[model samples]
Target: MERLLDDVCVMVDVTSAEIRNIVTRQLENWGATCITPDERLISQDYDIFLTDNPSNLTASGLLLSDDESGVREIGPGQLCVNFNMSNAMQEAVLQLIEVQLAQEEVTESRS
Candidate 1:
């Protein structure tokens, strides 16, 4: 099966290098467009913000941590999902991203 994520722009921001590298690699494996913006985060600069910090979880952001299980809406336009624990489950992280991206498609598909 081919999972090509072309439209969404996901940014990975985690304090831990281990987590960042793991997530980045996973995102790349799926042919997804993922970014690492460390300088500054401008509004609408990215479609999705994947971070471990709660403060960074904005309206268009997702919280990825080992603490969370499965994907859920933490707030309006914000997502909370698990990581590391799913190391045994290949494509777990990417699945969360696809689900988020898919939701966006439905929300914006008015035509």
Candidate 2:
């Protein structure tokens, strides 16, 4: 039987290698096995797809004109988080994942 962690896929797009490393490692620590900074976009299913630039926001189904909110739900199955901003780097990312997972839990409970 497949588990939720098995479906965890993250697409990161931060220019700083150091920041990317930290975020990648943190995600892995949290049970994420598949993480990438490639231009793969949404060629496959992913739980989180984040980018610093707004130009590629829609590519991940995010319709934000800017990163004012720093985090947004592109849609039901996709979340867009900004890691470039120093304001809430880790918090924003975790919050996005938390919300997604929490929502999933609620859905599964009702089933």
Candidate 3:
């Protein structure tokens, strides 16, 4: 987790380990029941992929794109993050996933 957070900080130009920790934890908590530990959230061209490989972190898959491809590594697949999406965008994506997971839990409980 530290390694991944460090990579995130490098990508986002953030210096606060606390901030990184918060974001990471928030995402983790949000996705606790939904996503596995090995999976990391990433977006490209306004699309989100719940992939298992993200290059610089996990797998051996190829990241294919046209807009500034291969900027950041995602999952173990080594998917390329497009230029349009950066760390901020990635964080936002993760936030949305967290929200989605929360909603799912609520729905399941009420059923």
Candidate 4:
């Protein structure tokens, strides 16, 4: 439940240059990398990858959904954000990243 916002590596897989830049800027020094799905190379370095495309959905990533037809909460793998990305959604995303990092930490420390 406790984590810093700057402690994660993020990947932004948005198609729009405008929205991608907007999200990358909001993430500031969080080391957000932008990539289009067509040319995307999956990596283990990222704590979370955000995308609006259904093809990009994976276990360790979240989606910026095109419609608000589904859930808004985080899960073990099913994470999503609505089209209208707000400050609150960003906060939720941060928390989800924090949780993933902590869980990863626990796994790493397990002998």
Top lDDT model:
1
lDDT rank order: 1, 4, 2, 3
Top TM-score model: 1
Ranking by TM-score: 1, 4, 2, 3
**What digit string (tens of lDDT, one per residue) describes model 1 on residues 1-111?**
444444557677777788778777765665557777657545446655677657665445667756665666666556666665443223444555566667764465377
* Candidate 4 TM-score over all chains jointly: 0.59
Winner on TM-score between 1 and 4 is: 1
Q: Which ranges of candidate 2 are over 4 A from the true structure? A: 1-7, 37-43, 53-111
Worst 10 residues of 1 by lDDT: 84-93
In every candidate, how many clashes are there? 0, 0, 13, 0
What would the per-residue lDDT of candidate 2 be over residues 1-111, giving only the tens digit for each residue?
Answer: 123244467665544566566655555644555445446544545676554445545354222223444655555545555544434444554566677676644443353
Could you tell me the lDDT of residue 22 within candidate 3?
A: 46
Alpha carbon lDDT of each predicted model: 0.61, 0.51, 0.34, 0.59
Better model by TM-score: candidate 3 vs candidate 4: 4
Task: Provide the lDDT at 17 for model 2.
Answer: 60
TM-score to native of every candidate shown: 0.62, 0.42, 0.21, 0.59
In model 3, state the lDDT of residue 79: 44
Task: Give the Å shift of residue 27 in candidate 3.
Answer: 16
- Runs off by more than 4 Å, candidate 4: 1-4, 29-40, 69-71, 105-111
